Amino acid sequence: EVQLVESGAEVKKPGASVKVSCKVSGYTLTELSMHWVRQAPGKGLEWMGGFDPEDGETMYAQKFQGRVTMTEDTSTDTAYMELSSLRSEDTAVYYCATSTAVAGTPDLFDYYYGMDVWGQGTTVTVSS
Amino acid sequence: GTGVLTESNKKFLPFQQFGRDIADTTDAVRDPQTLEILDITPCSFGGVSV
């Protein structure tokens, strides 16, 4: 079973890139689909974007295309995500979620889609 | 060795190269270039009485 730990909460002047990390345990990144979700205060949590097990690898939301780029380090087992051009509405808590890539024996395996295990959130704050 | 080389009906296994008779004398051989079994038989001989 995976356990997810988070990075530190941050506050930054708008006009710069942020760096949000997700460190996993037990199961390596190559066995897991990774996704990221924004939760604003007073609003529902919304999906930033994540991995695709088939027809592509990593794809982003339509309101966040060209803004969020997403790297994976198998050597240190960390999923980084970065985004520039901060906005005052982006004062929110960011979540990394993960799931198994497939399910079953190697002889008979089926593809898997979803967000199973939720890590702790990192509060990103854009102010003066 | 001296002899005649003939076609053999002895089914050699893939690892087996040489062949022996009951006497443990060289009875068959597998050529390294082309992989068929050549039965070795000594040339014609006999005793002569006058």
Binding site: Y27, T100, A101, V102, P106 | L13, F15
Partner: protein, 48 residues
């Protein structure tokens, strides 16, 4: 030197009666000291 044989055994005792001679499969020029051995198994991840 490794010798091997594969024999189809009708359901019963795993070590059967009779003779099945092992053909010499492979010889390896290793030239090391060996006193202990271990068997390698394949293991499958759960994903459930």
């Amino acid at each position: 030197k490794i010798y091997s044989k594969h024999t189809p055994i009708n359901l019963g005792r795993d070590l059967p009666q009779g003779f099945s001679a092992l053909e010499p499969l492979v010889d390896l020029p290793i030239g090391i000291n060996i006193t202990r051995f271990q068997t390698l198994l394949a293991l499958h991840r759960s994903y459930l």
